[PDB]
Symmetry: C3
């Protein structure tokens, strides 16, 4: 386990948005991907560059109330303030009561808990969210990672995103939901296991294999697929499968190229 240190900034963005960045003027929505191995400690030197209180709160990871990011625990950040947040992670192991301590590993996320309301409704709506992956020793690592956030009726706060791969690429997706509504995440031409890694461990793994998954606010899951496995290259749509949501125009493509670089035209 390594001790890692990063800077993070909350900033107002154009069009009434808010985002996290690794550097001032570089905030994105979603925020930057944070990747740890079980046992790693992360110190986030967080600077609130905004005129409203804001925080950093994380799902899944080990933190003390001093890093809750809540009003309740006085661990949000005043306008223009700085605070060091600490996230820890642990490997699984056998407890002295004979049980198995679940590790930190999994698909997680971070978001604001104080903009607009004491639940971060305003900050989340405006873009203060980002993905976190914690890996277990011997986890299969991907060729690329893509984050898809269903935030209210938006995808990654975009106007009313595409991801490119080549056939055979090991492609990871992080899938985070925020806001008021339930959604169903669907990907054409691909499927995954409903389990920790989104991949079956082997023949003894009875997890359902799905291409559709109901998600609600602050749900996070992830998976890896082999791009075009058994289906070939093409424009592979992903969408919410709630009919009226899918009808609002937000057509995302998983663009899987043949080895020569072509996609069967669309």
């Amino acid at each position: 386990g390594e001790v890692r240190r990063i800077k993070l900034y909350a900033e107002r963005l154009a069009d009434g948005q808010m985002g996290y960045g690794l550097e001032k003027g570089r905030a994105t929505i979603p925020g930057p991907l944070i990747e740890l191995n079980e046992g790693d400690t992360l110190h986030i030197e967080f600077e609130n560059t905004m005129d409203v209180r804001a925080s950093l709160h994380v799902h899944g990871l080990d933190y003390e109330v001093s890093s809750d990011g809540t009003t309740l625990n006085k661990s949000d950040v005043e306008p223009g303030g700085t605070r060091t947040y600490t996230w820890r992670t642990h490997a699984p192991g056998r407890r002295s009561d004979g049980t198995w301590r679940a590790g930190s590993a999994g698909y997680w996320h971070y978001h604001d808990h104080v903009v607009g309301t004491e639940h971060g409704t305003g900050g989340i709506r405006k873009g203060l969210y980002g993905p976190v992956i914690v890996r277990r020793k011997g986890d299969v690592l991907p060729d690329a990672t893509h984050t898809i956030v269903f935030n209210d009726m938006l995808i990654n706060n975009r106007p009313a995103p595409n991801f490119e791969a080549t056939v055979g690429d090991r492609v990871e997706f992080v899938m985070i939901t925020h806001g008021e509504y339930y959604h169903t995440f669907h990907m054409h031409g691909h499927r995954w296991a409903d389990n920790r890694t989104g991949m079956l461990t082997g023949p003894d793994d009875p997890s359902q294999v799905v291409d559709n998954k109901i998600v609600g606010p602050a749900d996070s899951f992830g998976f890896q697929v082999i791009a075009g496995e058994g289906v070939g290259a093409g424009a592979w749509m992903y969408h919410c499968h709630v009919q009226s949501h899918s009808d609002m125009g937000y057509v995302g493509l998983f663009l899987v190229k043949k080895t020569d670089g072509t996609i069967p035209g669309y």
Copy 2:
């Protein structure tokens, strides 16, 4: 596996409905049950008998973009048109790199993707949906299979269905959700495993045992029960457990008869 051929028709029905059928004028809502073993290939000679564009799109199974059933992938069908769709399935197994490839097996479904909207909102509403089961080698086979579809506030597009069995029958249910709303599927007197087959693989399988399940649009799961196991013969209701949904009167019965043919009075 085997190479199978079938014919499928989309037809308009009474009350502005649309159904799939294996023969002209035998369209049903839900559509016909398609059952495959992992490794089997299915060629569907699909005839759109209607006066609007229609398609056939499947979840879970292997298909090329030419069988996507979408306008994006030029694989919908003109009015009066014919198109051969091809569905493939695979068995699980280790890849070259030692990772486990999940099989096709599971509870799946097909539906229209181009009637009313480019997401099949009209076609789905009007009844262009059916079940698909892909079995693994050694899977327990049932005495009967019943399909229950929560389509918006309807069950199988019926106005505001019952299924008969004898005590000890192995009864399979396929549970598909479509449209706008989340639901909770509940069955009295019976329970199942929250996993691929709906049955525990044995004593190592940690899957939750449930009688109630949250489902969203395009969710599919299924399970087998022994009819009346440890509870006896009776009128065993299944219903959505969302209180306003269940109070609308959409409440079917799982009618489990004694071997003599009687049921306790209801």
Copy 3:
């Protein structure tokens, strides 16, 4: 093995409705019923109210005569009495070579006839409670706390906190009722998405979560080591649906140090 309890449905002073083990002792949620796989429980039920009321259970083995429905003539007339029978079974091998799933799990009981023939009125007013069925060898907790998301309410409280000490094995039963989906979230803690809410071992691939989508009549549960790797503190649990959490209904898992103290918080 064969067990009996008394249960009463009561209109509460405030117009809510609850189950109790004794007259004028009704709670919302109702009393925790705990059974071992194989156990039979006879519930001598008395509806003390001026409206028909029932007892219906998820997950456990019961005949249609204990359905607690109008359809199966097993609701109770005002002032009436009825013995409901709940059976349970261990898992085992059927002759057909298949594995019969046992009764064990996080379950619940609720009214099926107050207001409507689906208990919409009873559930709304507080006629719900938790049932735990344990398998032989299941790990037992220092305490059990029941959290019910009932429409927009938690345990029908006005617009609940649970106290533990660091290292306590604390069990939560999480039931949902009514009209809306929700997402249950607990700060500082996580559990397995499986039967027990606890990973069996390194061979259990179950997702480890701190946030779960739940709909009406869903039940799950889990055990945590209070404050494990995170320390003493006021650990909030809440719905993560943003308009739901903003309504003010937020409970605290108050994890105290062994000297009875807690880091300062501002509720």
